[PDB]
């Protein structure tokens, strides 16, 4: 059912955001400061946009939620040089966030996801 599922997503998103200790993924990459970003990145994503989507009922299953979180990480690895704070943060977030999503998926299974 939608109510318990959205509560699960909010908690999951909060935990993912807590893993981003440097607040690197909190808001969209500022395109005005990074004008070549869209030359490399097909679909930007960030935690604020995810929260907006969540509250606007755009995540009605777990896969769509996962897909957007995974974009946050994959975009960052793809765009940034390996020796940057950003790339290193994405490597860490993939591992830590991955554990969060594993646990959250198991919870979603216990509810009503297909």
């Amino acid at each position: 059912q939608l109510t318990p599922f959205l509560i699960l997503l909010r908690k999951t998103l909060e935990q993912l955001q807590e893993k981003d200790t440097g607040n690197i993924f909190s808001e969209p990459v500022p395109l005005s400061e990074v004008p070549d970003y869209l030359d490399h990145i097909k679909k930007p994503m960030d935690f604020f946009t995810m929260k907006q989507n969540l509250e606007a009922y755009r995540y009605l299953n777990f896969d769509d939620f996962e897909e957007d979180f995974n974009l946050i990480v994959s975009n960052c690895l793809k765009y940034n040089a390996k020796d940057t704070i950003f790339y290193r943060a994405a490597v860490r977030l993939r591992e830590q966030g991955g554990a969060v999503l594993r646990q959250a998926r198991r919870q979603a299974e216990k509810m009503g996801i297909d």
Partner: peptide, 8 residues
């Protein structure tokens, strides 16, 4: 594929 200039 090469990467971007960077975020600074």
């Amino acid at each position: 594929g090469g990467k971007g200039l960077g975020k600074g």
